[PDB]
Design a binder for this molecule. Structure first.
Ligand code: 8XQ
Ligand code: CL
Ligand code: FE2
Ligand code: ZN
Ligand code: ZN
Ligand code: ZN
Length: 404
DNA sequence: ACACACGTGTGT
DNA sequence: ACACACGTGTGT
């Protein structure tokens, strides 16, 4: 809508936009209700060159880490090359460090782990594997490997609408076999969490939130949540799951995704040094040489303090399946040397904390999560709860009338 | 173009 | 217990 192509990155404003970085701080200070050090903004640069290992699997090159307990809100922004207009700078990620009560995050971790390991039905996804479909990033033990579990409503190409188009009584929280008591406990946890996160979503990304509630009263059966204001329709739980680089292509246009992170008990204090850790990665971005306010020295101090961790290349042994998964293993050397030799190969990661809430337009931005050293969904290093709304979920009763 | 998706119910 | 049926956009 200005008079200033793919190489500048995807253009959208429903998370926030302004003429310069200072304007983004003004927006976020008003939205969040606090000023100054409570809000941190990082400039990130779109390169379009994807960081990945020699086997095609996700890597991080820089890690944005919470700088102190005084930092409450992290915002990643992209300045669009060449633009001087009202939307020259756009917001691509919002992270609330203190998202949900820690006692609730503690309880969800244990309850969801136990329920999903004794009754969970695995939901298969394309991003579970690399391009060649031969990696072992989830682990190779079927009893313990990382896995994804999907609930709520989902879009289906066979009905061009909700997958429950001809389900007399849909089970949004289906578990293995039939146990209504266990499914109701799981449903109660995730419905309560949907209800809690909706006001945070409205507060911090109001334009994306408002888009997601436009047809709430037209398709109530395809929405989660217990109170007025229901932006979500589906939720996926990921337990030690390595999401290879992808976009969520059938998410609705002009919406976003909210991610609630839960972590193992050894990674729940700010001063901690956990044994393992999973990161959320934007593979097409690099970090800036200046901080939010344009200072070179400020950015260097954040690198020395760990607030921005500059990683170096690795060479590790991994497994490679002898035959690809359709649609035995061997030990091979996997390295990231070439991704680190090129300064313009991307890989900006964030380290979300226990109980944090992350907001990003997963439909437009390429993203990934890193593989765990020893995945174990029975005692996961990280659980992510991923809340979204698919496209074409706007018909009553899961679109039963259209299907007829 | 063109292989590829956070599936379910009915049929045989 | 499989077997069939139902057929959408995006990235490349
Ligand atoms: O951060 C995660 O754990 C995550 C995992 C798998 C996904 O498909 C995601 N999609 C959008 C945002 C986050 C995620
Ligand atoms: Cl999204
Ligand atoms: Fe995703
Ligand atoms: Zn992999
Ligand atoms: Zn412009
Ligand atoms: Zn539905």
């Amino acid at each position: 809508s200005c008079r200033c192509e793919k190489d500048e990155g995807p253009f959208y404003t429903h998370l926030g936009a302004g003429p310069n970085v200072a304007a983004i701080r003004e927006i976020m200070e008003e939205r969040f209700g606090q000023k100054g050090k409570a809000i941190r903004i990082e400039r990130v640069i779109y390169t379009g060159k994807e960081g990945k290992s020699s086997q095609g699997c996700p890597i991080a090159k820089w890690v944005v880490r919470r700088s102190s307990s005084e930092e409450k809100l992290l915002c990643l922004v992209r300045e669009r090359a060449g633009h001087t207009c009202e939307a020259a700078v756009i917001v691509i990620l919002i992270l609330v460090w203190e998202g949900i009560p820690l006692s609730l995050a503690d309880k969800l971790y244990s309850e969801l782990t136990e329920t999903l390991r004794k009754y969970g039905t695995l939901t298969n996804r394309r991003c579970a594997l690399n391009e060649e479909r031969t990696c072992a990033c989830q682990g190779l033990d079927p009893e313990t490997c990382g896995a994804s579990f999907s609930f709520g409503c989902s879009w289906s190409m066979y009905y061009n609408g909700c997958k429950f188009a001809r389900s007399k009584i849909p089970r949004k929280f289906k578990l293995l076999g039939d146990d209504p008591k266990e499914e109701e406990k799981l449903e109660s946890h995730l419905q309560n969490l949907s209800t809690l996160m909706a006001p945070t979503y409205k507060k911090l990304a109001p334009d994306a939130y408002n888009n997601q509630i436009e047809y709430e009263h037209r398709a109530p059966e395809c929405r989660l949540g217990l109170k007025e204001g229901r932006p979500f329709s589906g939720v996926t739980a990921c337990l030690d799951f390595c999401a290879h680089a992808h976009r969520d292509l059938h998410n609705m246009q002009n919406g976003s995704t909210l991610v609630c992170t839960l972590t193992r008990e050894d990674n729940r204090e700010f001063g901690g040094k956990p044994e393992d850790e999973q990161l959320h990665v934007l593979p097409l971005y690099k970090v800036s040489d200046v901080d939010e306010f344009g200072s070179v020295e400020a950015q260097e101090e954040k690198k020395r303090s760990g607030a921005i961790q500059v990683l170096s290349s690795f060479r590790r042994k991994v497994r490679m399946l002898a035959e690809p998964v359709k649609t035995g293993s061997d030990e091979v050397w996997s390295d990231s040397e070439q991704s680190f030799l090129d300064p313009d190969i991307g890989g900006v990661a964030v380290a979300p904390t226990h109980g944090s809430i992350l907001i990003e337009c997963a439909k437009r931005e390429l993203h990934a999560t890193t593989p765990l050293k020893n995945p174990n969904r029975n005692h996961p290093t990280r659980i992510s709860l991923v809340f979204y709304q698919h496209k074409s979920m706007n018909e009553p009763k899961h679109g039963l009338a259209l299907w007829e």
